[PDB]
Design a protein around this ligand. Structure first.
Ligand code: SOG
Length: 478
């Protein structure tokens, strides 16, 4: 089947992780509290009552884990820097122990020939910024993020050449501020009674605006002060479901395109064209912030590459409604669409463990072509792709390792990826599996197993290779 030869010369293969999901050591070496420490320690927020205080303890076990990557022949590792290990209070006194830790990790990776692809922000805002000004809701976050980013460029950018400023700003905006299902857990209480505060109709657009400005601010610093000498690149990882029309009719075809504009375009149109999608301006109206001319000029062009986190594809239909006033405004209603993995009662594909994750390999190819055509063939990295098993206490570890479904998932998505590059002309530069190890899946806690390696939570976090480890090792052989 697939080999390295199925992909362009120099194509980069890796696994991906995130600090809060992997590291543990939440109180160690000066680390500041984050909005996810607060959220994980709040009743009702995590489905299995768990937390990531220890997680899979990668803070102490990264060398063991790096050898696991090297065992497969991985080229690269995507990981995040916990902001609160560098500035425990978000701004102010740098925490030297945080710098020293990430230097050891970066050096250990490079010692093994594995390139670091580093995410600056993977959701773990210092609680001090949430406390001071409600974090992403305030324009101050722009300057504060840019300063944190600058410290990372200054400390690590002699060795780190691939930066992802933000991970999934769309997920954060919607899950954090419309549904209130992720930190800081804000929403319109009239829509979801579990929330303490928020406004599903307004806050997501404010947060998204600030994310875009925050990236632009970091990128401006990078280009002006670091890029010439360091010779690296900056991008973002966008969460992107592919959307197929629920019917092959012009109304639903327009609906699927619209749902795409509201998901990827919300962020990517500003970065390529200097403004939000016209459909968002039309439908969200005054609730959607406006860029100034000077802001547009710093935002347009601020990506060196587009990271795509892609798992699944849904059907999308047009939706007509007649909302009962401002009170019930929400992002989904604003799109004028509804998207579901079901058509005429039939699911779009087999499903992984996650209730949202449908297995639809063709959507990888369809998305790569959409990005090519809409954005004039920018460089793309698949910054996340993978699937999860359940955490099943009724089966042996040995049986837990037989992840044949995961193998078929990667095989089929990568086959479609290879085709988009070779047949379709898409400029895809690399691919990162979610994830290296089983880990703490946010509000799903330890109920979801995404790892190439199985982690025994009952035996001091012992790592065992699932069948997919051998499969990747064989794929990556030279
Ligand atoms: C891509 C569109 C799918 C929509 C919503 C689900 C978003 C996935 S969150 C994303 O993927 C991993 C696996 O879920 C997380 O654990 C990572 O930390 C995070 O980066």
């Amino acid at each position: 089947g697939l080999t390295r030869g199925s992909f362009p010369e120099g194509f980069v293969f890796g696994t991906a992780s995130a600090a809060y999901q992997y590291e543990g050591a939440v109180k160690e070496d000066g680390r500041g509290q984050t909005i996810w420490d607060t959220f994980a320690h709040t009743f009702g927020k995590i489905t299995d009552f768990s937390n990531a205080d220890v997680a899979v303890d990668q803070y102490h076990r990264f060398e063991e884990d790096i050898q696991l990557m090297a065992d497969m022949g991985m080229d690269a590792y995507r990981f995040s820097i916990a902001w609160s290990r560098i500035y425990p209070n978000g701004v102010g006194q740098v925490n030297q122990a945080g710098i020293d830790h990430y230097n050891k990790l970066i050096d250990a990776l490079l010692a093994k020939g594995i390139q670091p692809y580093v995410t600056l922000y993977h959701w773990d805002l210092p609680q001090a910024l949430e406390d001071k000004y409600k974090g992403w809701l305030d324009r101050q976050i722009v300057d504060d993020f840019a300063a944190y980013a600058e410290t990372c460029f200054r400390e690590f950018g002699d060795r780190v050449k691939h930066w992802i400023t933000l991970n999934e700003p769309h997920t954060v905006a919607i899950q954090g501020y419309d549904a209130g299902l992720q930190a800081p857990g804000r929403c319109s209480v009239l829509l979801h009674l579990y929330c303490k505060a928020g406004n599903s109709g307004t806050e997501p657009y404010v947060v998204a605006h600030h994310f875009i400005l925050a990236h632009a601010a970091a990128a401006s610093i990078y280009r002006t002060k670091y890029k010439a000498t360091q010779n690296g690149q900056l991008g973002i990882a966008f969460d992107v479901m592919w959307f197929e029309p629920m019917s092959n009719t012009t109304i639903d075809i327009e609906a699927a395109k619209r749902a795409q504009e509201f998901q990827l375009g919300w962020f990517a149109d500003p970065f390529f064209f200097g403004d939000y999608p016209a459909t968002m301006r039309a439908r969200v109206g005054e609730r959607l912030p406006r860029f100034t001319a000077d802001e547009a000029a710093v935002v347009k062009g601020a990506l060196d590459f587009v990271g795509i986190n892609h798992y699944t594809t849904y059907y999308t239909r047009h939706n007509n409604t007649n909302i009962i006033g401002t009170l019930l405004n929400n992002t989904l209603a604003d799109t004028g669409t509804v998207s579901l993995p079901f058509k005429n009662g039939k699911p779009i594909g087999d499903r992984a463990n996650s209730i949202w994750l449908y297995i639809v390999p063709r959507g990888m190819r369809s998305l790569m072509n959409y990005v090519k055509e809409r954005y004039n063939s920018p460089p793309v990295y698949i910054t996340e792709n993978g699937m999860d098993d359940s955490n099943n206490p009724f089966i042996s570890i040995k049986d837990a390792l037989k992840d044949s479904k995961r193998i078929k998932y990667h095989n089929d998505y990568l086959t479609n990826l290879a085709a988009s590059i070779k047949e379709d002309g898409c400029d895809v530069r690399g691919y990162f599996a979610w994830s290296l190890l089983d880990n703490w899946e946010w509000a799903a806690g330890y109920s979801s197993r995404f790892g190439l390696y199985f982690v025994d939570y009952k035996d001091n976090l012992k790592r065992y290779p699932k069948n997919s480890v051998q499969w990747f090792k064989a794929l990556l052989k030279t």
